[PDB]
Amino acid sequence: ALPF
Amino acid sequence: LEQVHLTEDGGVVKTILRKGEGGEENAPKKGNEVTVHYVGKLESSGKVFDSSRERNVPFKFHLGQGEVIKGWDICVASMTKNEKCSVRLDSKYGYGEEGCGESIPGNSVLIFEIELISFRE
Amino acid sequence: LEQVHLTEDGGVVKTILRKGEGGEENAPKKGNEVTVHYVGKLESSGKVFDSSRERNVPFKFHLGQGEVIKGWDICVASMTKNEKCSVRLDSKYGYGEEGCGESIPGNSVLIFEIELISFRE
Secondary structure, rough: OOOO | EEEEOOOOOOOOEEEEOOOOOOHHHHOEEEEEEOEEEEEEEEEEOOEEEHHHHOOOOOOOEOOOOOOHHHHHHHHHHHOOOEEEEEEEEEEEOOOOOEEOOOOOOOOOEEEEEEEEEEEOO | EEEEEOOOOOHHHHHHOOOOOHHHHOOOOOOOEEEEEEEEEEEOOOOOEEOOOOOOOEEEEEEEOOOOOOHHHHHHHOOOOOOOHHHHEEEEHHHOOOOOOEEEEOOEEEEEEEEEEEEOO
């Protein structure tokens, strides 16, 4: 859930 | 420049801009801490959503451990030390149908420029 | 136990489960690489969405550099070596109105148990  | 398809669905496609160093000692292995610089933008709008170059802080993660999106684990595993690439990620290898946060819509294709600076066990 | 409101909006509220070590040398500084274990779940359902303990790989990031959700930068900056806490993040300090991927809906409150293992420059 990285990067954003 | 030649494009390397890293998956068979054309969802992870790497173009090498600067060739890294040769030899096995310059290729990272599963579990290694890799240190990279990156810039990510949306393909559709061209807008940058994140960059390690902005704060001037090389970004570190453990390869193949799911600390980052799938396309990164795939792309960085194919790189060698000092390589700079651009990689195009279908949403399947990014943030999928739902997207993530304010800058990444559902079903977004992502483009990253990624430089592999170093890695260690 | 005491609940420390790390922001005035009540959006980052840290409960210390295990007191860490005192002494200025045992508190991290902006830019330092911090090594943590964490378990994150949704407050509403208590469903765990991500955990470094799963893979048993301590997670490292550079404190205060925007590498992680804001609530982590704020929470970890308040911790000392060996501290274990539970922190409640309003969505403003997490993944916001949009949420992120399959497991984190928009407007979710997150609860993380975070242990600060060690840090270095």
